[PDB]
Amino acid sequence: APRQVLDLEDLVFTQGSHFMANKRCQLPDGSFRRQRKGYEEVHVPALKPKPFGSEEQLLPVEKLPKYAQAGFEGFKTLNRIQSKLYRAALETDENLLLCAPTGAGKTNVALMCMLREIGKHINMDGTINVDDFKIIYIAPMRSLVQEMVGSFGKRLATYGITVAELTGDHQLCKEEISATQIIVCTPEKWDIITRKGGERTYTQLVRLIILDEIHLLHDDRGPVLEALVARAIRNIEMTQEDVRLIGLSATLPNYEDVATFLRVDPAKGLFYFDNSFRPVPLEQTYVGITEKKAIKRFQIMNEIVYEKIMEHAGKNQVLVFVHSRKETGKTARAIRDMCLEKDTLGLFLREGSASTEVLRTEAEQCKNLELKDLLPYGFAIHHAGMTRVDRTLVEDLFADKHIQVLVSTATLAWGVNLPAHTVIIKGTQVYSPEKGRWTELGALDILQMLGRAGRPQYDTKGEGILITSHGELQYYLSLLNQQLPIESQMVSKLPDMLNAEIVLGNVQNAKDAVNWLGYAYLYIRMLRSPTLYGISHDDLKGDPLLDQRRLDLVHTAALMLDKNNLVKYDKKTGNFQVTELGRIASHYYITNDTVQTYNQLLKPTLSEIELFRVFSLSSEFKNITVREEEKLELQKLLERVPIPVKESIEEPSAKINVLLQAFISQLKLEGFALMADMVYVTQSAGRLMRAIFEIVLNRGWAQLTDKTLNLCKMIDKRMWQSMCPLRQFRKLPEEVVKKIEKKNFPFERLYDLNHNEIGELIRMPKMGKTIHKYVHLFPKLELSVHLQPITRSTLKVELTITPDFQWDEKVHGSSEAFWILVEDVDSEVILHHEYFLLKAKYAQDEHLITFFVPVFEPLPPQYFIRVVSDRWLSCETQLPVSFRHLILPEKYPPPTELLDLQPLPVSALRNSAFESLYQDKFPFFNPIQTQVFNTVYNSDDNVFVGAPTGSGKTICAEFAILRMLLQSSEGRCVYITPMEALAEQVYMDWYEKFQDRLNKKVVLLTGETSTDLKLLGKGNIIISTPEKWDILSRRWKQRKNVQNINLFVVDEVHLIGGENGPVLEVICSRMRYISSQIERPIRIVALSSSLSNAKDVAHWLGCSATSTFNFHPNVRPVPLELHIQGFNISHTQTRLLSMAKPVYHAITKHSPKKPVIVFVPSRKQTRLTAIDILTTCAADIQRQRFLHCTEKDLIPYLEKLSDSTLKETLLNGVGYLHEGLSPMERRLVEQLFSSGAIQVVVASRSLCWGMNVAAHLVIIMDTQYYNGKIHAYVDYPIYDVLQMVGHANRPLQDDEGRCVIMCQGSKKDFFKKFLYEPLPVESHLDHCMHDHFNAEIVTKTIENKQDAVDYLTWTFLYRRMTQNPNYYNLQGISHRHLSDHLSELVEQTLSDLEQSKCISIEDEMDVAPLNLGMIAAYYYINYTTIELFSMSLNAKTKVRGLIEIISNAAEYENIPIRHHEDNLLRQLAQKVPHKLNNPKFNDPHVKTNLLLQAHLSRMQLSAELQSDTEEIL
Amino acid sequence: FSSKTEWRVRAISAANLHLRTNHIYVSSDDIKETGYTYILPKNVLKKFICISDLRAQIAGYLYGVSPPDNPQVKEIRCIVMVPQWGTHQTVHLPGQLPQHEYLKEMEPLGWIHTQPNESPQLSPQDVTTHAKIMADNPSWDGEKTIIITCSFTPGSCTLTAYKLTPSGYEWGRQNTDKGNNPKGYLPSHYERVQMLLSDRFLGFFMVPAQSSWNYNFMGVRHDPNMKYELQLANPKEFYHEVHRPSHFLNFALLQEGEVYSADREDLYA
């Protein structure tokens, strides 16, 4: 039914993993319970060896898989469990579950369980090579992570499989963590990783997970593991790919629900074992203290410890695990004084005086701590509190067995293993700062430590003793005796996991949430024990599969999430929308209460004064409270901070705020509780800081964001801003550091000091070497800028990032990660902010960063650019970018509104032979064409039509074509359109429109000039491209059939701004020159997209204001539903992969019933995207939703394919479109789609032009594309946006259209702002100037600087550079300033031309072409490339040198370097017979030389590269 | 000030100074009609106020323009901060006049300052300060340069802007002693004139190119002979960690303090 409210507190377990979920226990066989004074004694004798199975023997290390035999060297025999498990491991991918108490070492069986896939990825002359598999070992303790990764990395090193730990940061370790093979990790680290979304990238090669010691699920920390288990199970059920599963837990019941939740089979995926097979028999003693008074207990416990020490005084060994670092060494020397004040009783515990080598611990005296004093005694102490080298130095004697009493910590036990005759758990309790009080230390800790009782060789049967409390020592017994159930404690965190999956997209609605609960253990566990978790059997029967109680659960998640604004979820829709709050929660593992706490506290003008309270108020430290004890040093911590603390006084608030202060200040603290809580709160404070940082970097609070990044970096350095910039380098000596610090000398001044000129002040002349070394190893970047106003609203800024540093790997790392901000004048309004990373490989290279920023009516005198290294503290780079020169662009006037005139049909024109070519197509012409008609068809003057992509100015050009045809039979028409494929499709339709129906032939320009001149003049309408119509008629006066063209149309000339526009602009100025000088009138037509500055272009082509059709994007037949999706992970791979579900779900929302055309980022990524689409159809049960026909219908057109997966793709109804698709395959797919048998087509960014298949929805994915010359990605072209966004054109049936574009947040506002209003366009012949002036000088069209100015006087540059000059580098907008700029550029270009020997400028006034200019403008190649040619040409020419000479051409500078082509290219240059002088792997010139060698060898590379080969041919 | 306790009590005062700057009060009195009217951007008054203290006085320098064919209005289009320490009674800012290509486009409009205590007259310090500047720098003009006070009243602001009479500048460059009661100091020495606010245009901020403006806490590095550069950068708040390096350099431990409580669970990232 409808949602049901739930209170989740009283239904989750207090004292997690200390519950003892089952409330009855049973003693062991030899168990004895005895009463003493204040102490009850529970003893248990060790069980019997389970007998040798009937010819069940250990498997030899040879007898097993020889391939897995790598790395276990020296191990000749197998453990009993090892042999029992090897068959299951090496024979089965059965989801494994190893149930064995501490001592079985199931790590070595998980070894073969992984070695299955480790051998699965191997070859003959090659190895396991890691391009196939990496398995993740989830371990609960960082000590276990360390020891396991260390031992295993060198163990399997014989096979050389990379064993690494997932302990690096997200971007800091993603590169080197990609080449990290089967890896250990903390489940918590993996949880943060999978919440951020980086885990998907290393996924789908993620073969296997091992879950070592899954008993942690009994804790409250088990919730993370439960989330991971549900995630893996559920997402593997949708991926249909398996995931190999190893599970591990100690001897415990409920193994069947364990195997259930692990998808492990009890059939053979189970490994269950009793505790009698302990290779060291396990004798137990437990001392429960009924003592009320902790006072008397604090003595009696030490007394019992002294008794137990007397028990092992002789030939024996004890290891005592204490709770505190100080109390450890305090518990020792208590034994010393005890054996001293009992009159040498129990001491003399050697073989005599010096026998049993008392001289070992005698000759070993000198140690850093006071353990030097305990070494003269029989006792010793060891911990990483004492030291790290000393820890190994004491374990040395412990392995020498020359210390009979070892006092240590639980972490030193759980670390590197050393076993003991006796184990002593001293108190079993710890001070939980999360609980802020005392409590028990959970199961697995005691498990590890009290599993060290007994050694693997050095004894037979080990005993151990745990001193605990009366009420709980029973649970302590039920823990080691496998009466201990293990439940789940996610029940409180459930809403957080729901938030997490909603952010990950793994749950859209409560339905997916319940499907995810289906892979949860709480399903199986709450089932098998319903009465326990609050499920009455009556309501259980009422809801047998518990969907309704699972949705009453879900109710609390939805309610709390909407209440905390981590999701925006409705009562009826059943789905939820997550926001920035839920995003930050997921990405930073932020708790949904602290998230609303931040949303409530954080304001724009936050100072550190209030940030202290805001950081101490964080709900993460809720149950940490100031003790009566601390209240003295509380004022002491207040009296030391550079920040004021009057905000709060002695309380939790003060405690946490001052504690953070001290954590930064590197402060001492007396109390152990003080130090513990400080450690914990500060550990949480780092993530808290990064979360507040995300919030502030989103909402835009500038000063708060600066302070927050600095505060994060500060707690990182463990130093405030007050430590010298030499603090970021721990390599400095502190004395010299403080000497250079004490002066008032800016660290931003140090670089002008030479090797010794730095020490010349500090009186440190001999240290100057390392001084300057660090002074330059300090990360430093320099930056320069280019500016241009695009619109009066928002200008664009282009960046240059050069290195002022010298990089080094242990100092820099793999990359320099910097947050840059485009910020208001006063640093208040955050206009933008980007995050960049320039790799060490990518170092020293300026990377083109390009962004726009807005301005307003009260214009500011400058903006600011901020650059800050992410973690580096005291690192900064400023750039005040000045607007003091701005020339505010011309407000382009209002466009012509669409007058609602009578619907004009094809019965408008009187000619029936014309009306025929429309009659059988449409009912009426759209009012755009129908208002432009009376000009284009009924008038001869110059007509201009500016219409957004899909409004049909091509039909109004066809109206002018009709007018020309009616005016003159053999009239000649020029159709100059830049787009080669669109123009090809236009000529293809014209060849049938006119040659067939009207019998007037159509001509299509091709390469060879003579046959092209044959085409024109013979054809009535000649279609061509910009340079296609520049090359021919660059000498037009010589050509007779050129001056005899009646009509001329510039189709889609708005591409003038974009590339290939300058050639068309020059040729159109030449057309205007024809219509001026030819003494005849030539009809001029200009078609463009939505245009703001339309009138200037209209005049520059010679059109009237009455004739220039300037219309808004709102004027089109098909209205739009336009959507933008901002993706927060700017990493190309991670973005492209994690944004998969969004496109199919955008279908399921907007166009689940109509055509979808999905533009993708790569030729290969189209495939991957279509595959992910079909896979998301599989999960979203509606399968074959794209198929609009029968299965045997597909075979008739599926008989023609070469791609193997394209057949199944067609059976799924998706289909691809790319350069790889053979022309027939592309046409066939297009045919099925245009018929409507196909629904959703994976189309390339390269196929965005030449398609005839429009759509209802057009979905753009990954607007960035990767270019190799600069080794970086770029944004998609604006004209590409226009074209592929117009590609949704179904005015035939669809009453509107659907457009979707999912790009970065940077390119989100880009489209949102540059799409709705029109686009501006400038001319760039100002940049490429040699070409047109060269052609004119060789034609004698422009023979003198006067003539060059006259030629420029008819261009669109003349108009626009005079209109908004500074964008064209003109600082003065006047007439004389225009002349100045024009004649100056003329002087410079003609001077550079003559200097390149292009032509001779006589007297500096006249000009006359030379042989250079002649041959250059003859071969239509750039004059600068011809200059490099003239520098290459020598008398001793051979084809070998000349090949590189003529391949270095800028005419081959269009061939790009594509995604990761550096190795294959060197392999191909290897198999080509000509080498290269330092062959460059990012030079398309070396690429072209290798390709010409391929052309000479007839060696068949891929067709991808053969495209470039043939193009260069 | 106690240097520790007066340090915090005023730091936690400062944390909401922006509270005021939607409560400022404007100087309305009889107009000269022959002099100028000096119009100031509201947001730079905002920042010039919230950066200040409510006892320590700070001063800014006004740069700005006259608009073409509208002479007698003085746009205040930029404010310069120079290195300085002030008392609670006045501001002490070195003799070096802020020069710049940025400050080239403008004429020096004079000087403006915070004021803790409400005083409906010109502070003797202020009159002798404008005088003493007139004494060594003819860059300022008497018909062109004015002296603004802006007092922090109860949670509010109250600003006035004065101009000196001849005997005003005369006695000012006459006086040397530094008491608020200098003999021969009289209300004959100033004239209060028309100042206005502006949301109408944007002023911009100037900060030394190498240093701070609040040497208030370093009585050491400030000398009437010391020299400074400038840039268009924002004044950071009175007490920001740049101007307080000693206490941020106050750390006194022996570094092995990490010896105690070495249980080391991280498990994240």
From Swiss-Prot, chain A:
A motif (DEVH box) lies at residues 1051-1054. Keywords: Acetylation, ATP-binding, Coiled coil, Disease variant, Helicase, Hydrolase, Isopeptide bond, mRNA processing, mRNA splicing, Nucleotide-binding, Nucleus, Phosphoprotein, Repeat, Retinitis pigmentosa, Spliceosome, Ubl conjugation. ATP binds at residues 100-107, 947-954. The modification Phosphothreonine is found at T1025, T1362. A motif (DEIH box) lies at residues 212-215. Its EC number is 3.6.4.13. One of its GO terms (biological process) is osteoblast differentiation. It catalyses: ATP + H2O = ADP + phosphate + H(+). Component of a core complex containing at least PRPF8, SNRNP200, EFTUD2 and SNRNP40. Component of the U5 snRNP and U4/U6-U5 tri-snRNP complexes, building blocks of the spliceosome. Component of the U4/U6-U5 tri-snRNP complex composed of the U4, U6 and U5 snRNAs and at least PRPF3, PRPF4, PRPF6, PRPF8, PRPF31, SNRNP200, TXNL4A, SNRNP40, DDX23, CD2BP2, PPIH, SNU13, EFTUD2, SART1 and USP39. Component of precatalytic, catalytic and postcatalytic spliceosomal complexes. Component of the minor spliceosome, which splices U12-type introns. This is U5 small nuclear ribonucleoprotein 200 kDa helicase. The chain holds residues 404 to 1916 of 2136 of the full protein.
UniProtKB/Swiss-Prot annotation, chain B:
Changing F248L: In RP13; reduces interaction with EFTUD2, but not with SNRNP200. The gene is PRPF8. Part of the U5 snRNP complex. Component of the U4/U6-U5 tri-snRNP complex composed of the U4, U6 and U5 snRNAs and at least PRPF3, PRPF4, PRPF6, PRPF8, PRPF31, SNRNP200, TXNL4A, SNRNP40, DDX23, CD2BP2, PPIH, SNU13, EFTUD2, SART1 and USP39. Component of the U5.U4atac/U6atac snRNP complexes in U12-dependent spliceosomes. Within the minor spliceosome, which acts on U12-type introns, interacts with PPIL2 and RBM48. Core component of U2-type precatalytic, catalytic and postcatalytic spliceosomal complexes. Found in a mRNA splicing-dependent exon junction complex (EJC) with SRRM1. This is Pre-mRNA-processing-splicing factor 8. Residues 235-269 are annotated as: Required for interaction with EFTUD2 and SNRNP200. Residues 37-168 form the MPN domain. It is linked to Retinitis pigmentosa 13: A retinal dystrophy belonging to the group of pigmentary retinopathies. Retinitis pigmentosa is characterized by retinal pigment deposits visible on fundus examination and primary loss of rod photoreceptor cells followed by secondary loss of cone photoreceptors. Patients typically have night vision blindness and loss of midperipheral visual field. As their condition progresses, they lose their far peripheral visual field and eventually central vision as well. The MPN (JAB/Mov34) domain mediates interaction with TSSC4 and SNRNP200. Has structural similarity with deubiquitinating enzymes, but lacks the residues that would bind the catalytic metal ion. Contains a region with structural similarity to reverse transcriptase, presenting the classical thumb, fingers and palm architecture, but lacks enzyme activity, since the essential metal-binding residues are not conserved. Plays a role in pre-mRNA splicing as core component of precatalytic, catalytic and postcatalytic spliceosomal complexes, both of the predominant U2-type spliceosome and the minor U12-type spliceosome. Functions as a scaffold that mediates the ordered assembly of spliceosomal proteins and snRNAs. Required for the assembly of the U4/U6-U5 tri-snRNP complex, a building block of the spliceosome. Functions as a scaffold that positions spliceosomal U2, U5 and U6 snRNAs at splice sites on pre-mRNA substrates, so that splicing can occur. Interacts with both the 5' and the 3' splice site. It is found in: Nucleus; Nucleus speckle. Changing H243R: In RP13; no effect on interaction with SNRNP200 and EFTUD2. Widely expressed. The chain holds residues 2067 to 2335 of 2335 of the full protein.
